[PDB]
């Protein structure tokens with residue numbers, strides 16, 4: 001359980017992300033696809049992308065990034081009370097997309113890497129710790145839902 005102080009550190013850096021959610025989304029998904037190429041194979045719509053240039057030029061991938069970060073932002077703003085938001089997300093990711101917790105760990109790493117790079121003024125050690133705590137909570141809760149839905153994850 002995160003403290004209010006930790007939630008504020010999370011929301012404070014997220015406020016910066018929101019200045020340009022599309023740009024942050026591109027950086028994050030590109031970082032993920034490059035650090036862990038296997039994750040790209042889960043996207044029938046994007047698995048053909050060969051280079052960072054192509055990824056950057058993809059309007060659909062940009063849209064996907066906005067969709068993803070907006071959903072994550074809504075979850076973070078709930079400050080742990082995200083039961084309603086997690087239900088549909090866990091169902092689609094467990095049953096349709098089949099995204100292992102391991103891949104959620106990979107994207108969590110990508111998110112932290114990008115925020116660390118773009119926002120040193122709001123992502124010091126304490127802030128990163130708070131974000132990690134928030135993302136671990138997210139994955140923990142997603143894992144529990146995966147279990148209920150019959151997915152090993």
Ligand code: HEM
Nearest residue numbers: 039042043045067068071072088089092097099103104107
């Ligand atoms: C912070 C974690 C993540 C969030 C909040 C998130 C959110 C979303 C949302 C809101 C959608 C659209 C609605 C839906 O289908 O549920 C989506 C679609 C999808 N997500 Fe995730 N996602 C996350 C991580 C991942 C990861 C790590 C992968 C893959 C390695 C992944 C793969 C997919 C796929 C395959 C789709 C469908 C893309 C398409 O429309 O072609 N997601 N995700």
Ligand SMILES: OC[C@H]1O[C@H](O[C@H]2O[C@H](CO)[C@@H](O)[C@H](O)[C@H]2O)[C@H](O)[C@@H](O)[C@@H]1O
Nearest residue numbers: 101102104105132135136137139140143
């Ligand atoms: O922070 C690095 C560790 O990250 C992962 O573990 C955290 O998140 C898991 C959820 O994805 C939890 O089950 C685990 O309890 C958390 O510590 C990763 O699995 C670990 O190997 C890393 O050391």
